[PDB]
Write a structure and sequence with these properties.
part of a larger assembly; 3 chains; A little secondary structure (39); B alpha+beta (341); C mainly beta (271); A: 39 residues; C: 271 residues; mainly beta; four-stranded antiparallel sheet; binds fe (iii) ion; Minor tail protein (chain B); Tail assembly protein 1 (chain A); Phage_phiJL001_Gp84_C (chain C); Phage_phiJL001_Gp84 (chain C)
């Protein structure tokens, strides 16, 4: 919800965009965050 | 075949066979999880298959030692497959953020003394009790502030610096107010002017949210619908929003976050911009206060959440307080446990 | 008793004091017009003036802009070459007849630029929340370790590779010393020089090249004197052979020589 507080500057929430890469592309399951390398 | 797994211990050493295989000058690969499969069958001549692994951590690999370890193990039932059910060991987001600011191995690595410990104990207080964990990933690494943005959005909190010490601190946006002790603000008690006096016909706000999370057991994305029946039954067509909550590992917590967002963004959102004298100099973003303008604007003694604050200079006296209608914590409305077959 | 006076409608006193701190090298300022003395120190009345301690959670906008007279040594620290170590600014908010100046801001001195108002410069001071633009990209398997020399992971001893000597002759972006002559070329490539400044205290800045008795620095020269010794540290090529031969730290190396040329398991026949 901190996005909701971030949009506290709005003029009043629909969106349409592509993504800037994050850590989703999977090759090793992580039941907990051990972070990862980057190659 | 056999498998040598080296966990990258601080003083780790590996068998000479691995270095002979890789050949020439080689390191000990200290600090990194490195698996060595000496088995001769990597695959049949049909080209080798792809691999996957599964791990978890709570206390291992902490530069400078662990912090507050007795609340990091957020276990919770996150089963995929009803008969295949088993609990998963989600991490405490409070410890996630503490690592983000308390290790030089990536990011800034702020010293412990400059981090407000008691505030992270405060965070853990509610994060562990309600069992809000996380299983986030940080592959293809990006800017640190963006990752903290993601984590804060997951927990719905505010990272901030203590006014007195200057230490970095964390806040959570919750229901931590008793609606009795709150100070009452009217023109006769410190209020100077309501800079936001209009109403923008805020009756058609969002009424549906599609929460997307990631179950580690399935290790793929999952989704949850949440319809605010009250708004659908009167407003007509939907005003929906698909929101990202990857890393949340179960449907119960996904439902909790979905309900939190839906009740926060849908129920009578009103933004207050308040001109204040030296009556709220201690008031800090995220605080709570009650405002009253009954004889000019006719608003009935409402409780408001404090947002952005603009402290004044030695001249000009007043402080501008951006304020937002009440937020909410997690709670149980829906029973969305898909329980795959 | 501060809050009672502060929240009063018809009672109050003006004070806004500023503490400029650099490893305990102190300047105690007062925006008021008097010789204010509190917290066991005298806060001199200087032409400092705040522009508002804004807290919005947005970087750049919250940058506290101080109007600081140039003649102060605080600005003097930033003439030409700013300090190599961050300077912290603390603001306090007591009244008179009061003695608990509740601290209100603990930002650091990020940048300074003089301009149209020569009697006071603009000092920008954000806080920890807004300084988080770091790359984040750290590990990134490669043919050479990404570890910074002498860091917490390379762990090469800070004392085993000491080098120090007083400056034989300062020069334009270059320094000369007798000790450097005893070393092979490039021994300090990526190194840094260290000494104590009568005000900055510890000062550390890098070296970009070495040859014989001569070296070159990545940064500028803030003025140097052939007195104090320049505690100079060697750098490293950061190669596996470099970390092995020079440092004997191969066992604590983070670079992977045998990154298998990304020998795939797709596309073409292999294995
Ligand atoms: Fe090294």
């Amino acid at each position: 919800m901190w996005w909701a507080l971030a949009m506290l500057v709005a003029s009043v929430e629909v969106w349409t965009a592509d993504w800037q890469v994050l850590g989703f592309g999977n090759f090793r399951t992580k039941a907990v965050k051990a972070k990862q390398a980057k190659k | 075949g056999p498998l040598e797994v080296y966990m990258g211990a601080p003083t780790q050493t590996v068998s000479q066979k691995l270095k002979n295989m890789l050949g020439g000058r080689q390191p000990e690969f200290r600090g990194v999880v490195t698996a060595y499969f000496d088995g001769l069958i990597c695959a049949m001549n049909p080209y080798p298959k792809q691999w996957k692994f599964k791990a978890r951590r709570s206390t291992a690999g902490w530069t400078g030692g662990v912090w507050y370890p007795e609340k990091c193990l957020v276990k919770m039932q996150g089963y995929d497959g009803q008969g295949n059910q088993h609990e998963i060991h989600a991490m405490n987001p409070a410890h996630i953020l503490y690592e983000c600011q308390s290790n030089y191995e990536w990011g800034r690595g702020l010293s412990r003394t400059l981090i407000d410990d008691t505030t992270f104990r405060l965070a853990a207080d509610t994060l562990f009790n309600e069992n809000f964990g996380l299983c986030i990933r940080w592959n293809r690494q990006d800017t640190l502030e963006s990752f903290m943005q993601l984590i804060l959005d997951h927990i719905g909190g505010a990272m901030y610096v203590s006014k007195v010490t200057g230490k970095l601190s964390l806040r959570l946006i919750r229901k931590d107010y008793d609606f009795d002790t709150l100070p009452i603000f009217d023109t006769d008690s410190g209020l100077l002017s309501i800079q936001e006096a209009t109403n923008a016909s805020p009756a058609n706000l969002v009424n549906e949210v599609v929460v997307t999370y990631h179950n580690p057991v399935m290790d793929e994305d999952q989704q949850v619908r949440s319809h605010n029946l009250a708004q659908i039954q009167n407003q007509g067509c939907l005003n929906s929003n698909t929101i990202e909550y990857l890393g949340i590992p179960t449907g119960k917590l996904a439902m909790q976050v979905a309900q939190r967002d839906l009740r926060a963004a849908s129920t009578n959102v009103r933004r207050f911009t308040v001109i204040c004298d030296r009556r709220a100099w201690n008031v800090q973003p995220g605080d709570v206060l009650k405002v009253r303008d009954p004889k000019q604007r006719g608003l009935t003694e409402v409780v408001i959440r404090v947002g952005t604050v603009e402290d004044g200079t030695l001249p000009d006296g007043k402080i501008k307080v951006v304020a937002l209608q009440d937020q909410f914590a997690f709670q149980l409305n829906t029973f969305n446990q898909v329980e795959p077959p | 008793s501060y809050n009672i006076i502060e929240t009063s409608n018809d009672n109050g006193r003006p004070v806004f004091m500023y503490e400029f701190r650099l490893l305990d090298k102190y300047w105690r300022y007062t925006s008021a017009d008097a010789k204010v003395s509190a917290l066991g120190s005298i806060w001199e009345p200087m032409g400092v003036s705040d522009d508002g301690i804004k807290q919005t959670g947005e970087a750049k906008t919250d940058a506290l802009n101080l109007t600081l007279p140039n003649s102060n040594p605080v600005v003097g620290l930033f003439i030409g070459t700013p300090p190599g170590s961050p300077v912290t600014l603390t603001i306090r908010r007591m009244h008179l007849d009061d003695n608990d100046p509740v601290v209100c801001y603990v930002g650091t001195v990020d940048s300074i630029n003089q301009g149209e108002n020569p009697t006071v410069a603009t000092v920008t001071c954000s806080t920890l929340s807004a300084t988080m633009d770091r790359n984040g990209l750290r590990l990134s398997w490669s043919r050479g370790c990404p570890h910074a020399l002498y860091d917490g992971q390379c762990r090469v001893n800070k004392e085993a590779f000491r080098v120090d000597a007083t400056i034989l002759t300062v020069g334009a972006g270059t320094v000369t010393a007798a000790a450097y002559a005893t070393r092979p070329d490039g021994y300090f490539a990526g190194g840094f020089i260290e000494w104590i400044d009568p005000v900055y205290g510890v000062e550390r800045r890098g070296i970009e090249t070495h040859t014989g008795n001569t070296i070159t620095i990545f940064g500028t020269v803030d003025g140097l004197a052939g007195g104090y010794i320049l505690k100079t540290y060697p750098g490293c090529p950061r190669t596996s052979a470099a970390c092995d031969t020079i440092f004997n730290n191969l066992a604590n190396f983070g670079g992977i020589p045998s990154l298998p040329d990304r020998s795939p398991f797709d596309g073409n026949p292999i294995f």
